[PDB]
Amino acid sequence: QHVDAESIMTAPKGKLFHLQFMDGLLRPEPSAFDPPASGEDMRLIYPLQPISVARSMRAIVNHNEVDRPRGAVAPSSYEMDTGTLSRNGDLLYSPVANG
Amino acid sequence: QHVDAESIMTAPKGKLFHLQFMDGLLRPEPSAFDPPASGEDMRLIYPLQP
Amino acid sequence: FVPDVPEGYVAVQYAHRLFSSSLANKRNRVTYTHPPTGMAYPSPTGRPH
């Protein structure tokens, strides 16, 4: 689904819009000999701030040329540090060093 | 169609064989992210001349 | 009987790291990079002992 500029420009201030943004990391490459198509894709409306602050991983595939895909993101180490239950009952990350 | 080595090796001397040879100039490239398939293509019988 | 290992062979610990996808003659081969020299070997044949 799409969002007209007509509404982005003339809506009551409280409206919650829902923009969609393709992540094109995994778009297939055209065959080397296939003739060009004609038009250009265009994007009129852009975020002012990063979208996908929620992202934890991206492009879990492997490229056949470069060792890791451009823009592929590994999960953060903190997603994986079970650490410990402190005697108080608060959770803790594992210590980074002895003592 | 294909030509068995069994016939290339045991046929009367006058037989006219018909070998086929792919020209692979225009084989499509695999997408960069598509996982490998397993086997290898092999060619046992080759021309001595162009 | 256990066949003895021939004199030219190099020992290699298996690891997931050794094998990968790679482009090679218009297909994605299961390449084996070879730790002593680092050469990639897209084909199962022609690999070092």
Curated annotation (Swiss-Prot), chain A:
Coiled coil: none annotated. It is found in: Virion. Belongs to the turreted BTV-fold inner capsid family. Homodecamer; each decamer is made up of two conformers of VP2, called VP2A and VP2B. 12 homodecamers assemble to form an icosahedral capsid. Inner capsid protein that self-assembles to form an icosahedral capsid with a T=2 symmetry, which consists of 120 copies of VP2, with channels at each of its five-fold vertices. This capsid constitutes the innermost concentric layer of the viral mature particle. This is Inner capsid protein VP1.
